[PDB]
Ligand binder design. Structure first.
Ligand SMILES: [Zn+2]
Length: 314
């Protein structure tokens, strides 16, 4: 029979030679098969396909190991979701806005833009080689693979409404934050004190208030007895912190933060904007850039720099 030589892969680094029957679909021979994101499972090999690399599902022990070592996941549908998203993100545009790689608007991708812009302003190293490799290229302007990966890891399809706080959570889970530590103390006038220690992702994220200073002074939270307890920051050790809260009018002053995310909309429909504090305040809305000395808007996430902090409260 007529045949061509193609290479299969799961990480696009380790190739596996294959002789394919041109009279059979790639699916009949390899299972679900993708070419640069396009699903060729039901397609038959072309002559132009000779020597090209195709993605396939891990169908043998060797591919299973290569897939995990690269992506750090054994979700059976991961590759399918990564390839489906890549077919869209590879068409997106990734301009350099104020020295940072952004994303031109498309398919409700605003949350990915501000997520990507935030990454380029905080110290963070990913663990999965897939994210390492893709993030390095996103920084250089080719973020199509990185975005497809963020969609795949976060179990989001192109066009789906996404949450920045949730998205950052997944990415931080795939990053080295083992050196991060946080100590809190909850004071209830009826139940006394109660210190708590957090590590890793839970050490750099808080949901309730946007102000890092107010976190140090104290924030009101419900106690089981019915009173309102006061939780404040005892000790922090991390290169950054993420403060989040439900969208609410909030003033971002120049020089008091690294960057933030604005959200306009509701739980079913909205748009994200990015605000970064450099020589002045810049608002990056995908490919759009505006500046101002003062900013006030519906802020939902604020990122601050950090190294080591210890409270003076006693
Ligand atoms: Zn109490």
């Amino acid at each position: 029979v007529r045949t061509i030589k193609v290479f299969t892969t799961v990480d696009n680094i380790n190739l596996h030679t294959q002789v394919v029957d041109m009279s059979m679909t790639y699916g009949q021979q390899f299972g679900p098969t993708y070419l640069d994101g396009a699903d060729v499972t039901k397609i038959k090999p072309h002559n132009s396909h000779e020597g090209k690399t195709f993605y396939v599902l891990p169908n043998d022990d060797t591919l299973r190991v290569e897939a995990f070592e690269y992506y750090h996941t054994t979700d059976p549908s991961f590759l399918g979701r990564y390839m489906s998203a890549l077919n869209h993100t590879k068409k997106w545009k990734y301009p350099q806005v104020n020295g940072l790689t952004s994303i031109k608007w498309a398919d409700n991708n605003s949350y990915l833009a501000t997520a990507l812009l935030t990454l380029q302003q905080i110290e963070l190293k990913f663990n999965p080689p897939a994210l390492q490799d893709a993030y390095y290229r996103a920084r250089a302007g080719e973020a199509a693979n990185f975005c497809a990966l963020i969609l795949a890891y976060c179990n989001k399809t192109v066009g789906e409404l996404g949450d920045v706080r949730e998205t950052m959570s997944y990415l931080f889970q795939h990053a080295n934050l083992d050196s991060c530590k946080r100590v809190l103390n909850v004071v209830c006038k009826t139940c006394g004190q109660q210190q708590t220690t957090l590590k890793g992702v839970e050490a750099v994220m808080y949901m309730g208030t946007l102000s890092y200073e107010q976190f140090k002074k104290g924030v009101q939270i419900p106690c089981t007895c019915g009173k309102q307890a006061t939780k404040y920051l005892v000790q922090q050790e991390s290169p950054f912190v993420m403060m989040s809260a439900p969208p609410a009018q909030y003033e971002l002053k120049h020089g008091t933060f690294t960057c933030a995310s604005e959200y306009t909309g509701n739980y079913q429909c909205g748009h994200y904007k990015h605000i970064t504090s450099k020589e002045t305040l810049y608002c990056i809305d995908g490919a759009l850039l505006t500046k101002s000395s003062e900013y006030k808007g519906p802020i939902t996430d604020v990122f601050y720099k950090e190294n080591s902090y210890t409270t003076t409260i006693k």
